[PDB]
Design a protein around this ligand. Structure first.
Ligand SMILES: O=C(NCCN(CCNC(=O)c1cccc(O)c1O)CCNC(=O)c1cccc(=O)n1O)c1cccc(O)c1O
Ligand SMILES: [Cl-]
Ligand SMILES: [Fe+3]
Ligand code: NA
Ligand code: NA
Length: 173
């Protein structure tokens, strides 16, 4: 396993004043980048969606829905608030074999249109990270998408580690 290193959190911006309620709801993953993410033009990534529903006690209840093998699989987990508004950590961490650490950080969002969230995961002792271009709709402006490509590069990811999942209608509507 050769892997680009996770950047210093120092160079991963936080969205200052973070409104945890205005971020609730469905988000379409219009952009996906990471040191373990790789463009594959034979079988391009199908677009998927993540639903953030706020508990209860303010931890998010994060359900991801994605269309795989002619069905909808539901990846479900909890984000517990961390250091500061916009930062979270994975809840019930012991459920996941090999998993030592998981860190969520909301880089930027205007809540009703778009969002960039940074994730950093240490699993089986290897250190992964990814960035997510969240769209409230399935398509986004070139401005936002290129701005995301720039940020993804600012953290050492080359263009072939940056994908834009192709929109689908299965499971995600
Ligand atoms: O279940 C999923 N498949 C993960 C397959 N995978 C790709 C590489 N990951 C990555 O590149 C990656 C990098 C940073 C953060 C992530 O969540 C990542 O999946 C690695 C599998 N990951 C796990 O075992 C895992 C166990 C427990 C929580 C968790 O989130 N993950 O992923 C999955 C689906 C939708 C969104 C996710 O975020 C997922 O994780
Ligand atoms: Cl993924
Ligand atoms: Fe994950
Ligand atoms: Na390590
Ligand atoms: Na749904």
């Amino acid at each position: 396993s050769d892997l680009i290193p996770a950047p210093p959190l120092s160079k991963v911006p936080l969205q200052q004043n973070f409104q945890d309620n205005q971020f609730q709801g469905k988000w379409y993953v219009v952009g996906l980048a990471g040191n373990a993410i790789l463009r594959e033009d034979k079988d391009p990534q199908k677009m998927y969606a993540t639903i953030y529903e706020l508990k209860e006690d303010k931890s998010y209840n994060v359900t991801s829905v994605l269309f795989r093998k002619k069905k909808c699989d539901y990846w479900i987990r909890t984000f517990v608030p961390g250091s500061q508004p916009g930062e979270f950590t994975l809840g019930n961490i012991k459920s996941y074999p090999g998993l030592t650490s998981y860190l969520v950080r909301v880089v930027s969002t205007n809540y009703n249109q778009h969002a960039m969230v940074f994730f950093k995961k240490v699993s089986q002792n290897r250190e992964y990270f990814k960035i997510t271009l969240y769209g409230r709709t399935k398509e986004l402006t070139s401005e936002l998408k290129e701005n995301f490509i720039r940020f993804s590069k600012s953290l050492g990811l080359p263009e072939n580690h940056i994908v834009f999942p192709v929109p689908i209608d299965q499971c995600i509507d």
